[PDB]
Every structure is written in C-alpha cells, then in structure tokens.
C-alpha cells in the first residue's frame, strides 16, 4: 500500500539528519536545518519494538527430540516416522517464511504512513502561507525566526497573528497594481463634491 | 526561507526480500536465524555427558571386556556413540528387544551397580569358573562379560537349579540374563548332560517358559553355538524367581535406577570440552535467544526451532535511498 | 496502515450519535446537528459480518478423539502418539492466534480508510466555499437551511445556485477588521460617506 | 455552521490487542472461545452413556461378580471409567492384547448376550461345577466369572475333549476363553490327570496350539499358578471347533454386535445427568457454536476445535476514544 | 484499506483504453485522448509477476505416497496412520484458502494506491491552474495543443512559461461581471447613485 | 479540454473471492487448482508398469497358476493391483508378514529369477514328483506353486534331510519356504512316517526351530491342513542352512532385487496405454504446472500437492466495473 510518499514525491534521503528517522530543515536567514522529531518517531520505535518482541513470543522452543532405532520388519512404523518428521518440519519452515514476507511489506508501508501523516500535519496548520512547491518544501511569506519555526515543529502557529502582512505580502505578489496606480477611475475627485453635498446637507 | 520535510537515510547495504520486490536495501535490520556453533560438545547444566568410545550399549549393558575403561561411569547428560562403537556382543546371538531398552535408557540419569547373587556364595553345586570362550577373547586370555556368569556342570552330577530373589531398593531395577543353546546334541550332553532341559522366569507380570533349540548353523567368529539375551524391570515389593536346568546364563549384577529425564543416543564424533550451554546438537553447542535454527534437526535441550532455510532477515526501518 | 483520520487531525468521538458510525453535525440557524449516515456505515457493516462469516467458516469442526493406551513394550509407539498429538495442538493454536491479530490491524485500518474517504465526499462536493478548518469543520460563505444540509447528506448540491452570492461575499470578507473598521485607499468611509450623503438626499 | 464530521463512541472498555499495541478498546468485539461447562455428563442424542463404577473392562467382560452390577446392560453411547475402576481379572495372569479389544469395542454400540454351551447340556463327561476358587470369593462364597466355565475331571478319569461351534447370526460374534495352569505338576496331575496336556482352537483365520508350562513363580493372591485369556471375533457363516485335552477355560456366554462409531474409554467422575447435548469431555458437556475450544482435548462427537490459549477477542467496530 | 478511487470519486473504467491498466484521456483541438500510460504500469506487471512466481515458489512438489496395509490386529497403527494423514490434509487446505484471499485483498488494493497517486502526481505538477472538476478532470486555463499534453504525459510542464495568460486568463473567468464594473468594489455601480444624490441637492 | 485519468477495463466474467467480498468480478486472473486428468495409466519416464490382473501379489510371487501368464516379468515401474485380484493362496494358510513383504516390494525395480535347488540333481533321497493336491488344480489337474515344492518320501523311507545355499551374487537375495502340516496323525505318518518332526532355517540372523501341529478343524476349498509360509532377505557373503525332518516346502526359484526406490501398489481398474508423463494416480494421469492438485491424494511421481477445495482463483488485475 504505497502511499506515494517514500521514494514518491519526495525522492531522496537525508544523509545529514542523524537522530531520528522523520526530520525538519528550516532555512531562516541564520543557519539551516536537520533537527529531529523526537515526538512521532517515539511511537514508531515502540511499535516495531512491540512488533518483533510479540513475534519472537509466539514461536516456542522444541524440546529433546531423540533419533529413534528399529529393527528390520518395523518398515511400516518407520517410514510412518519419517513420514511425520518431514510434515511438520515442512509445515514450520513454510508458516516462517511467509510470516516473514507479510510482515515486511506491513512496516515498510507502516514509515510510509508515517511520512505522509507528518506532511499533512504541517500542511494544516499553516492553511493559505507559504505556497507549498516540489517535494514537501514551503515558503514563507511572512517572515519568521527560529521561535516560529519552533512554533511550527511544536505544531502552534497563532496564524491570525502572522495573517494579514503575509495576506499583504500574498496581496502585493498578486496585486493588479495597474488598476490603482495611486488616482484612476475619477472616482476621488467625483466623490468629494459628494461629502460636500453631504456638509452641505447636514448643516 | 524554508521549512522542507525529510527523513533519515544511511550508507546501510543489508537487503531484505519482500513480496513485491526482491534485494530491498534497508537502514536497520535484525536476523532471527542461527548459523554459528563451536565444533564442541560441553556438559548440559554442569554434568558430563557419558561417552561410550568404541562401545554399543549392549556391550556396555552386558559388559564386553573389551569396553573395560568405562566401567565405573553412573551418571551423565546424555550418551554419545561413534561410528565405531562395534565392540557389542562378542558371542553371536540375539538380544531381543533392544530398542525399547533403549528407550527406557532415555528417561533414566544415573545408575547404582551392584551383585544380585556373588559369585562365590549362592552356588554351591555346579562348577562356576570353568566355562569361557576363545571367540570373546581378550589380550589374548579368553575371557566373558563381566556381568553374567556361565554355568556348568560338576562333573558328570547337575542338580536342578531354583533361585529367587526379591527387590528391597525402592527404585526400579533391572535384571538382564541369557540363554545359551550348542548346535550339536553331542555337545549339549557334553556340556549339560540333560537330554530336555528348560528355564523359566516369573515375576508377578513376567512369565516365561524357555526351552533351548540344537541345529546346525555357519559359524560366526568361530562359533556355530547361539544365546539369546532377556531382560527384565522389577518394582519395590515384587519378587523374582529362576528355576533352570540346563540353559541360563546366569545374572552377575543389576541396576538400581533412577528418574531424571530426557536423555539421548545421539551418534556423533566432535569431541569433548568442558563449557556449559543450554542447547546441545551433534554437530556442537548453540547459544543465542533468537527462536530459529538451522544447523541440525537432532537436539538435546532447550533449543531453539529447526528450520530448512537460510535467510529470514526482517526489516526494522526504511528504504535506504540516497540522494 | 494509519490514515490519519481518527485520533489524528479529528480529535474526538462522539457519545451523543446513537444511530450509525459515521456522521455529521449541523450548526444552521435552528438546533445542532448528529444526523447519522446509514449509507456508507451499511457498506462497512456488511463487509465485517462477511469476514467474519468467513473465519468461521474456514476452521472446521473436529470429531470424536478419544486417548489410547499401550503396554510396557510399546513406549516407541505411544511417544510418537504424543508427538503427533503435540504438534498438531502447536500447529493450530499458532494459525488462530496470528489469524485474529492480522484481521484486528485490518479491520481498524477498514474504519480509519472509510472516515478519510467520507471526509473526501464531502469536500469534493464543496468546491470554494466553507473555508474548512480545525477538525474538518466548514463554514458556509452563503447561507442557508436545513434542505441545503439534506442535499449535501444526499450527495448534492447545485453548487451553480449558490456560487455566486457566496462568492461576493468571499471577495469582501478581508478588510472590515485590520483598522477594526477596514483598510481601503481613500475611499473606506469616503464613500461610506457618499453613502451618508445618498442617505442625506433621499430622506 | 459547520458540517464537522464525527465517528460514533461508547462508553465500552473490552481490549482487543493488535500487533502494534497492547490492550486497545474497541466499541464492539465478539469472542471466539469457549471456557463454561456444567460439570454434567449428559446423554447423547438420547441413549445413555453406561458407567462402569469400580469396574475394569476386563472384569466386566469376563463378568467379575463385584461387577455383578450391570448385569443386564446392553446399550449405550460411549463408556465411562473411574478412577476407582479396579477389578479386573480376579484371578491372576494375563489378558492378552487388552488394548486391541479396547479398539474394537470403541466402535460397537450394543449387543445381545447369549448362551454359546449351555451349563447342563453339552458337557455329560465331565465335573462341571466342582471346582472353583476362593480367590475370586463372592460373600466369601468360592466364586467364578459368569461368562466362563471351569472344567474338572470326572472320578479319575477324563476324555479327551472336542466341541464345535457355528454362527447363524449374520453379525460378528465375538468369543472368549483360557487356559489354566498350575505351579507344581502334582496339582497338574491332581486336576487334570493327565502330564502333558494341549488345547486346540481353529476356525478359518484362527489357527493355534497351545500348551501349558509348568513352574514355580511367587503366589498372587494366594494362587501360585496363572491363566491366561484370549478372544476371537468370528463371521457370519465361519464356524469355530474346540479341542481340548486338559487345561481349558470353556466360554458360557458371547456377544452379538452392533455398529455404530464415535464411542470411547472417557474416564472421569463428575456426576451423571440426563441432559441432551452433541459434545462431551471429561469435565462436563459444551453448548456454543463458536470455533473454539478450551476445556480439554479429549472430546467425543460434534465439539468446537481445542485450542491452549487464553483469550481470542476479535475486534469488529472503532476505538472508542472520547474527548 | 480502500482509498476509494476506483468506483469511487472516480466512477467507472475505459472500454476504449485498450493497451495498458492506467491511462489518460485528453481532449484538445484536435483529436481525442485514450492513450496509455506504459511507464507507471510496467512497475505493476512486474510487481505482480514476482508475486504470483513467489507464491508458486514457496509450495513445495510432493513425492510418492502409497497407502500402506495392516492386518486384523494393527488397529491402532492403522487409526494413527489415518489421523495423521487427515490432519495433513486439513493444514494444507486451511494454508491455501487463506493465502489466497489475503493476498487477493492486497492486490486489489495496490491497483487502487496506484490509480491515486498517478492522480497526486498529475495534480501536483499543475499549480493552480485548470480548476479540477469531480472525477479527476480540469480545464486548462491557457490553450495549448497536443505538446503541452504530451509533456505533462512526460512529467514536464515548465509552468511559468504559460502562468501569466493563464493568469489573466483565470482573473478574467473569476471576473463574472467584474470585466464590466471594475471600479475595485462595487463602486461602478455605486457612482451612479452619488450623481443622483448631486442632481437632488442642485436641483 | 482536460485530460481526465482513468483505468482498463474488459468484459471479461471471472470471478475472484475477496475477505470483505464475495463473487466480485476482476479483469484478469490465473488459475491454481488442477482437475484436468485422462482415464489412461501411461508409463513413467519410459519405462513400462506391471499388472496382475486377477493376481494377488502373494499369488504371483508364490506362482499360483492362475498367475501363469505374467511368468515371464522381470522389470515394472509401479506394481498394479485390480479390484478383481484376488488369487492369493490357493492352498489354504497364513502368509505371515505380508504386509512388511509388501513394503519391502516397495523399494525394488527389477528381477533376476533363478533356480534355486535344480529338482532334477539336489534330491537323490526322496520322491519329488508324488506331491500335488487337487485342491490347487489347473484346467481339472491337480497343480501346485511354481517357486515351491512340495516334498514326499521316498517308499517308506526318509534320510534327514540337510542342505545349505550360499550368496554369491552381489546383490541382495529373497527366499521363500513353507510348512505343511495335516490335521490326523495318521496322515502324518500316512505321508511323513514320523512321530515327531522338525525343520529349522539358520542363516546368522534369522534362526528358527519350527515344528508343526495335527488338530481338526473345518476344512477350506475340501481341505482341512494347513500350510504356513516365510520369507527372508539374504546378503552376499552370509548363507543360508534347511533342514528338515517331516514338513519342508522346498525354495526352487529365488530373486535378486534391484534398488531406485518409489515403487507403488496403486489399485484401479482404468486401461494401461502406452504415452508417458511424471504423474500417476488411481483415476489418471495428470500434466500441469500449477501448485495444487485435486484430484486423488495417492500419487507417483512429482506431483503437486492434494488439496480438498474447488476455487482457487487469484486476481491478478481490476475490478471490472463498466460505465
Ligand atoms: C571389538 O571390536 C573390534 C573392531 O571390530 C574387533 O576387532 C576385529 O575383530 C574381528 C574378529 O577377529 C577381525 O576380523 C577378522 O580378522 C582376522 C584377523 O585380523 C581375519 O583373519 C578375518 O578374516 C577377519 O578379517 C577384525 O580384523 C578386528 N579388527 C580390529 C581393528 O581389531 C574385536 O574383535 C571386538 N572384540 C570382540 C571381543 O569381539
Ligand atoms: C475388587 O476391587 C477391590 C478394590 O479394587 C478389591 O478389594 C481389595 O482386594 C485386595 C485383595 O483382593 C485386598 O488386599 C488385601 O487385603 C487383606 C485384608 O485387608 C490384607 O491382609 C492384604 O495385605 C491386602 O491388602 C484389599 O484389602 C481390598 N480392598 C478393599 C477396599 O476391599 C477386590 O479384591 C476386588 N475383587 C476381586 C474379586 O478381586
Ligand atoms: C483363482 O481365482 C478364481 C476367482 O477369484 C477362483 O475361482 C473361484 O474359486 C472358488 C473356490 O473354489 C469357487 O467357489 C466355489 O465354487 C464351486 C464351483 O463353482 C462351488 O461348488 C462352491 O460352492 C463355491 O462357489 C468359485 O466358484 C470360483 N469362481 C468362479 C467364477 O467359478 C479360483 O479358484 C482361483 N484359483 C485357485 C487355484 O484357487
Ligand atoms: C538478489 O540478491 C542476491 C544477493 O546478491 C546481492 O544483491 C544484488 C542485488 C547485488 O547487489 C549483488 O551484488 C549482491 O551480492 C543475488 O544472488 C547472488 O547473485 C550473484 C550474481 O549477481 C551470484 O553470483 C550469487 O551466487 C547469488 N547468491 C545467491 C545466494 O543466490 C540475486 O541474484 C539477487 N536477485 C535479484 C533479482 O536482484
Ligand atoms: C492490559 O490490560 C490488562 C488489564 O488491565 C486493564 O486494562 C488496562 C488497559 C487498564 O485500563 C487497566 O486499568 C485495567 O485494569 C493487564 O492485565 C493485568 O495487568 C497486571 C499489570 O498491569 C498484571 O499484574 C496482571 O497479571 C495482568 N493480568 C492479565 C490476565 O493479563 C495487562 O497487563 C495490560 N497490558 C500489558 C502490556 O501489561
Ligand atoms: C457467488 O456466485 C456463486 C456462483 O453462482 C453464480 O454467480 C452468482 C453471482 C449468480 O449470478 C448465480 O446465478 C451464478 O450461478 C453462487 O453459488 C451458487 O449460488 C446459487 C444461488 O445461491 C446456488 O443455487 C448454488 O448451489 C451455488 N453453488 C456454489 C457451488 O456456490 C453464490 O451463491 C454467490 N454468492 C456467494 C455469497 O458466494
Ligand atoms: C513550542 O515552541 C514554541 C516556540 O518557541 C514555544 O513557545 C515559546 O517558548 C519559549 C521558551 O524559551 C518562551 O520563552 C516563549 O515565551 C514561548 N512563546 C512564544 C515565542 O510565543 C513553546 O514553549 C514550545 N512548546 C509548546 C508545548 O508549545
Ligand atoms: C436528498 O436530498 C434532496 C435535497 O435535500 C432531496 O430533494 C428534495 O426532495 C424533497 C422531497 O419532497 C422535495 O420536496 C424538494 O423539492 C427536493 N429539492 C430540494 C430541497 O432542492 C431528495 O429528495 C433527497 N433524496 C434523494 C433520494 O435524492
Ligand atoms: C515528452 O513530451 C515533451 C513535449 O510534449 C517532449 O519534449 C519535446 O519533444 C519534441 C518531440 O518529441 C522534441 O522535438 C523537442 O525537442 C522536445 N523538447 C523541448 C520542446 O524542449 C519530450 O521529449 C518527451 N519526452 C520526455 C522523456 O520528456
Ligand atoms: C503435457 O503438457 C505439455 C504442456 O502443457 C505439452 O507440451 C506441449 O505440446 C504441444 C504439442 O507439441 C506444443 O505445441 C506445446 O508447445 C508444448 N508445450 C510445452 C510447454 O512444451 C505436452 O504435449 C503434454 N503431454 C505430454 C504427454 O507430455
Ligand atoms: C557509514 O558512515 C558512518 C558515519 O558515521 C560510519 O560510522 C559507518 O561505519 C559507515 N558504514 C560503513 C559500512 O562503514
Ligand atoms: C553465550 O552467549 C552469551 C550472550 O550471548 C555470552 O555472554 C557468553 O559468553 C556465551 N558463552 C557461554 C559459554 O556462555
Ligand atoms: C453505557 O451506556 C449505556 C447507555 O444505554 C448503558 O446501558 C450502559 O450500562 C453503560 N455502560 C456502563 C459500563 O455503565
Ligand atoms: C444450549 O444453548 C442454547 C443457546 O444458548 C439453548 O437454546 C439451549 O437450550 C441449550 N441447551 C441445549 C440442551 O441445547
Ligand atoms: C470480449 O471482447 C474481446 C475483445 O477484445 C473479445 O475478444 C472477446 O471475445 C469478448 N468476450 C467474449 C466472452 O466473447
């Protein structure tokens, strides 16, 4: 079940990010990222961990099983030995492989949905800023230091209070500035006898 | 600024095989599947495994002179055969049901020996020393297992023989004796002088009539005569009885048993060292937790499970993709 | 499989819906809302009762087995009757137990799949309105009644009939609180002012 | 308004455990396995199971008098034995291959028995009542198993014995008989008269001599000589001869037998009741239809899979998480 | 885990679509789509192919079993023989019904991962243009010819070489009556009323 | 324009089971279960089966003339019972150890049938040619085995019979013998002239002493004797010692027995033909690649594996849903 997010739009590993396994790289005008999620990748360590201690309790440990001897007109009862031995060791070695394999497929996809819930996560809180491009990387419009950014990595962003400026700096990248040039449409000087009608009227 | 999500990557090279894709390179892994063993075989829980050497079991049990070393061993892990444990029984016979005696072995851990009847006190009619043969020979003597007896006559004068005895030991013992049989009926009279001759045994669950056979037979090692072999377990209270004439192979010794469980017969030849482990196979010793194992079916001990594959590496992270 | 529906971005559940699994919960202008859907929770039940129709299916229903007895010549016979008794026993209470397990991740990753493809119908439906936010809670630009409620549970909504008051309303939501009365060039209580004088002339 | 979007919750606390996580509450689960029994050992399918009390097959079959009990049973289910279930042979020997006639009878269902050689009648040459031990004393009374005869001789002197036997039944038929013999051969000839002796008994697939031995063994129960016993099926048609010198055991009653399968040696002691169901283990009778079983392996007819496990909860709805 | 794209915001399948599993159909100046996507949709060929071969893999070939022969005295032997055989029988079948409906859920499922996430990755190579419609169809705000379509095909798309007429192209389907009064509100309308207001208080 | 995405589909109606889901219709699917088999039993990997016919295996290798035609064989790939195969023993008796003679067959390839004792030259003692009965007779006259022989007097005269054989052929030797004995002790002296008698087979490890028995019993086929049979493996080197006083069924053919193992007796009645495959069962012949067998579970050859289910389809593709 490939959610389309290792390897998918995100192409390539981090060789820089050393602690956990689900990072950050904020790129302020001081310094640049690789810092951790030591919160989310908790869970998926306690998971695992939980995965592989269950499957080693359910297998169990055999005990003294002795090789045993016949004389030369027990055939029948041998064979039906031999006959019993290979069953079962066919049936144990065919129940752990495809344990295995089972298994394999379910956690690779597991840090998939790891991947991609973080993503979403940090694409909700921060709704109509930073216009997010390529694979998983955003903008900015406002400008913040590293307290925002940790507001971020702590999933707070108070967004009305970052709204308005970065709606401006939205505005002022996607102004038709044309149309107001300061004076159009003569509407300013039009309107103004307008209020005096209007002093005129109230006195 | 910006603010671009990722995760870890590493210079792992570990492969995982999954279903949809083979050769999957993985940050972190974990085998669950043993390949190492020592070439040796250490005592289980600080006891010494007997070793017979060049010795079968019966040949041991009846005491082959030729198997002297071991005489005195009482206890053990478990009992170790070579392939060249041949010394068994020196006089060509048959010992009837040796499989389940076997089997008995392999739930008893230790032995006390001792005399059922001595040698010099509880036959005072027939001659006790004067019949050993060449073809169980030994450094030159010809010699006898040193845990039965031959009978004979005294001189051209047999009475018939009755003896009992009863078990005062609490524990279990076993009782082994032998029938012997010439093939000719001229030596039948030379050596017992009874035209008919009979044996019998009761117990109080064992009963049985033994009446000898004579006919001619290619010899083996020198010997065209027979005897077969028969044994027996008592309990605390029950009694024994022989009540012979001419054919018995008397008992010298018997074995006061004891519980302790599962004991094996493996047949193997790495050699004896002197560690500890909990797992004990015939190709060495194992020590690990994890729940496979590869190396050999055969085990003796807590061991973990026998399988017939090679890899089982199981993934515990993500796909090692560079960039 | 986490999709990252519940417990994930939508936070709680909900003692007071009774009827189904899956519903909704209407703020219009009269009373609250926990309407169930028996629509899609009906899909969901049907498919959990065919699984486990089907598990029980699967394992059998044994018949008389009765325990046997030897002598004592025949200890190679009853241990291997033993044997053949414990292996069986392991063999089986293995299957069922790592049966159950498989089909408990499955069935909760059913659920989380089926809240997340709910969630998807009901934005698709909406095109630019109801500016969602929170835990998947909207807003409705026009408004309107309990029958446009209806009409979105049954799956419509011709959107064309409200598109457009809702959407001159989305054009002057901004500027009416950035000055706490709204920052215009020139013209914001200006022609609020003409206004006053259109006011002044046709009293 | 809002159209905000909820999933149901509850206020249920029951845990299913998945493999990520321990101890997960589910809105609604459904168990799979059974633990609760009546302690009640009821019919199947209408027809009683018969208990046997202190009463071994082996005595039962032969008709020890202890077992006088069950005198007239002839139907059942299945068979039930106790821990007090005891007498057997009363007097000493050996039953030869008792488990294979348990085997047999573990798919009859019921019989009708019958006067193979009636008492009066097919014996005028013998002493047909005088001798029986006290070993097997009913009231301290000198007594005998009702299903056989022993056989005397008649004044110092004794014919040679031969009888035959045919079936007309068109059902198997199912035979029983032994042989005596004695420790000394002055009670041999003081019985029988005669110092050898032979039985005979052939049919088409039965083929044996037997002859007796005679040996001193330790007393049991104060006899110091045994019988053995043995038994035959026959067929439809096959007919049976007897022929007999001196050491006989003679049948007085056989079996006629029915089919009819799935009927076992369940020994327990938890009471009897007259319930109906179609399930039965030694700790009582199960009533569910789930596919799992936890009570005890040894079960008889239609019963739900045994399993060693504890708790098999199936998760079927959401995690009831409330705010 | 259904993430209910197939028959679901996507309805049904393409008859026409002859050569692959995952395809487009566009529907420019000229000529019509129904052309294949063979890149995403070998990953699938392949990926089932070494499922399919694995699975024939891990099933083992059996050798010569005979029935065996016992006289009337054996019967235990015999009922033994019976019982292992029968118990064979039933973990063999048990193993296969299993595999195969697990395995017939997970596939079904990949086809359904793959069908969304070509969807992801074409909508995430077009910004904010071609306003998507109901099941995965757009509009292509600025024209272009069967080249833009093969490039996106392609996974290129040079975005600003068409944004600026897309631009405007957009603002000016967003304009309703807006390309008619355009004095930045509702002002053109609003003049009029001011004159009105004048002419009263000169009149 | 758009470019709207979408997904093949067929008109393909096959359908595959799901968990959730059952009958649901897919694109493209494989087949894993296998019915397929023509009603023929073709050679195995070029070389030719046998069959009995009206022959049961103890019959044939007695050589019980109604198995006359199939004298000649020497080579099989799998022996064939039939339903009709029921000439066994035409002498009335007991074939002791069939069964382990049979699973001893199990494991040979071919013959090399050779006189034993040539009946013109090792008897210069008895008359050889006065013993036939008509109980075992050929097209009216009275017949006997073809591997056997019986064995007379010689006019009121018998020398004690001795005579060894020895190994000198490699490979490992299969002899059979047999011990009359009628049910009157005239006809005991009638045909033997001998109170008592005896035989006794030795070779190193199979000894015997056997001595027959004389008791009525119901005749079978007009007769009422008996006659047992046995049977012993030989090595090279050891030899082998008859001899025999009053009961002897002289070997006069033997066999030398080839290995290459998986040797069947599959019972049925379908025509041999003459093709060739891997795979054989009681109802045909089988020639796929897929992994699951369905047809009979007794096979030869390497043949998938039996299975007790009817649809094994796996989806490979969509859920072909039209518009
Ligand atoms: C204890 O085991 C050893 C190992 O088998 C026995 O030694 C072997 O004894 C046999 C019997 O004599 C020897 O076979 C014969 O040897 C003679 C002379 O060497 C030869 O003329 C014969 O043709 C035949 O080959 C064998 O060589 C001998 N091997 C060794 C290594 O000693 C020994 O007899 C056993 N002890 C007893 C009491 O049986
Ligand atoms: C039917 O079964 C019962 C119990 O299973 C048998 O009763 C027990 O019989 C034995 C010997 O027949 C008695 O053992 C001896 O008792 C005497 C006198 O007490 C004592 O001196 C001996 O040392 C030995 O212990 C035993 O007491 C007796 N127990 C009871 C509770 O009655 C009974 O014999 C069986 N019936 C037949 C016909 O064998
Ligand atoms: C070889 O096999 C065939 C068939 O399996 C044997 O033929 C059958 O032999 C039995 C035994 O004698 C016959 O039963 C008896 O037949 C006579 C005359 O028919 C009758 O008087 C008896 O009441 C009884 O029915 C049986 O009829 C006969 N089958 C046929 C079709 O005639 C044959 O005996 C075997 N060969 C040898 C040497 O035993
Ligand atoms: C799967 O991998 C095994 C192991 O080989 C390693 O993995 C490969 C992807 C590649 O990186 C190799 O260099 C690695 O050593 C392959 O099996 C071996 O293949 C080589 C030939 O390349 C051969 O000489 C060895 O004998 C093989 N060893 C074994 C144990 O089979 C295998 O070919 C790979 N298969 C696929 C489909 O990738
Ligand atoms: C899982 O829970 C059980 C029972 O605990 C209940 O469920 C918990 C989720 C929580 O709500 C508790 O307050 C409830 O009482 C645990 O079972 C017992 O746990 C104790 C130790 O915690 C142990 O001593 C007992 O022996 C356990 N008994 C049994 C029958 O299990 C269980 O331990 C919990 N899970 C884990 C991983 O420990
Ligand atoms: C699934 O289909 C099988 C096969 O029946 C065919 O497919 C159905 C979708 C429908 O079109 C039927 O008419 C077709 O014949 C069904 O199995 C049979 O069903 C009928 C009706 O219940 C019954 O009479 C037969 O005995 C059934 N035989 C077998 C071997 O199954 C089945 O009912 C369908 N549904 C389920 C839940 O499996
Ligand atoms: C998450 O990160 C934010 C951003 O830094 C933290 O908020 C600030 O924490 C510092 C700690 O030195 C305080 O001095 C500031 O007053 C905080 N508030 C601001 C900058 O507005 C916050 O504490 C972190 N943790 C949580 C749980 O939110
Ligand atoms: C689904 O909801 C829609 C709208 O909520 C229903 O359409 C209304 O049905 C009522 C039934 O009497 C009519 O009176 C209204 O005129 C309908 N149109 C509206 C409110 O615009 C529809 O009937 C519901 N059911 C289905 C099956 O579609
Ligand atoms: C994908 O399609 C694009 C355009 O639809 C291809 O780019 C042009 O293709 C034409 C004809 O194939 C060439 O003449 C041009 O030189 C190409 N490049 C331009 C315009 O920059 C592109 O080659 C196709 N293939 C791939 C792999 O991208
Ligand atoms: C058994 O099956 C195989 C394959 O199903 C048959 O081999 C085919 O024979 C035909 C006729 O010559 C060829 O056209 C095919 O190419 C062959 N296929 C393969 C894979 O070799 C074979 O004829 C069948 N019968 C026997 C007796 O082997
Ligand atoms: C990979 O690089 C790390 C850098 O810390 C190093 O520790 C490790 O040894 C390297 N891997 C190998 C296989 O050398
Ligand atoms: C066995 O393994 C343990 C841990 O793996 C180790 O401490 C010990 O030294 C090993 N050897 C012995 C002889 O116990
Ligand atoms: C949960 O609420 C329901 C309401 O119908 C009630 O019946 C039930 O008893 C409650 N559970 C507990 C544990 O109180
Ligand atoms: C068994 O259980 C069912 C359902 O619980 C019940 O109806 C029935 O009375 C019970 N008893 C018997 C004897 O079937
Ligand atoms: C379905 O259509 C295909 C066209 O490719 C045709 O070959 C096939 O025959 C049709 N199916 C049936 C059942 O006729």
Not at chain 1, 143 to 160: A, I, L, Q, R, W
Not at chain 1, 185 to 194: E, F, K, M, P, W
Request: charged residues 20%; contains cysteine; negative net charge.
């Amino acid at each position: 079940g490939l959610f389309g997010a290792i390897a998918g739009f995100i192409e390539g590993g981090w060789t820089g990010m050393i602690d956990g396994w689900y990072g950050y790289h904020h790129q302020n005008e001081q310094g640049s990222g690789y810092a951790a999620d030591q919160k989310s990748t908790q869970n998926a360590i306690d998971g695992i961990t939980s995965k592989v201690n269950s499957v080693i309790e359910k297998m169990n440990t055999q005990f003294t099983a002795v090789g045993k001897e016949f004389n030369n007109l027990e055939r029948r009862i041998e064979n039906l030995n031999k006959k019993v031995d290979d069953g079962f060791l066919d049936v144990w070695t065919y129940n752990a492989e495809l344990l295995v394999l089972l298994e394999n497929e379910r956690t690779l996809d597991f840090h998939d949905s790891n991947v991609r819930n973080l993503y979403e996560k940090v694409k909700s809180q921060l709704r109509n800023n930073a216009k997010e491009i390529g694979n998983g990387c955003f903008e900015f419009y406002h400008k913040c230091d590293d307290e925002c950014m940790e507001s971020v990595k702590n999933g707070t962003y108070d967004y009305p209070k970052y709204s308005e400026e970065s709606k401006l700096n939205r505005e002022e990248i996607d102004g038709v500035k044309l149309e107001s040039m300061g004076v159009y449409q003569i509407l300013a000087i039009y309107s103004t006898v307008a209020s005096s009608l209007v002093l005129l009227v109230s006195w | 600024d910006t603010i671009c999500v990722g995760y870890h990557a590493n210079n792992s090279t570990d492969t995982v095989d999954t279903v949809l894709e083979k050769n999957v390179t993985v940050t972190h892994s974990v085998n669950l599947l043993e390949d190492s063993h020592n070439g040796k075989l250490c005592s289980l829980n600080g006891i010494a495994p007997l070793q017979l050497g060049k010795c079968n079991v019966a040949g041991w049990l009846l005491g082959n002179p030729e198997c002297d070393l071991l005489l005195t061993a009482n206890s053990w892990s478990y009992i170790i055969e070579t392939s060249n444990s041949e010394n068994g029984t020196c006089y060509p016979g048959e010992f009837i049901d040796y499989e389940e005696l076997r089997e008995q072995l392999s739930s008893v851990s230790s032995f006390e020996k001792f005399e059922i009847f001595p040698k010099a006190s509880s036959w005072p009619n027939h001659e006790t020393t004067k019949g050993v043969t060449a073809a169980c020979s030994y450094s030159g003597a010809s010699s006898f297992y040193r845990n039965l007896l031959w009978i004979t006559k005294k001189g051209t004068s047999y009475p018939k023989l009755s003896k009992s005895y009863t078990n005062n030991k609490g524990k279990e013992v076993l009782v082994l004796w032998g029938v012997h049989h010439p093939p000719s009926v001229s030596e039948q009279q030379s050596l017992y002088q009874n035209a008919d001759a009979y044996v019998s045994v009761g117990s109080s669950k064992y009963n049985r009539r033994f009446a000898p056979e004579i006919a001619a037979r290619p010899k083996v090692r020198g010997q065209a005569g027979r005897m077969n072999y028969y044994w027996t377990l008592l309990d605390q209270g029950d009694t024994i009885t022989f009540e012979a004439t001419g054919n018995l192979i008397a008992p010298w010794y018997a074995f006061a048993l004891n519980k302790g469980s599962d004991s094996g017969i493996i047949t193997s030849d790495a050699p004896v060292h002197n560690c500890d482990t909990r797992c004990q196979t015939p190709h060495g010793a194992l020590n690990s937790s994890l729940p496979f194992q590869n190396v050999h079916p055969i085990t003796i001990g807590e061991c973990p499970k026998y399988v017939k594959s090679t890899k089982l590496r199981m993934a515990t992270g993500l796909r090692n993709v560079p960039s």
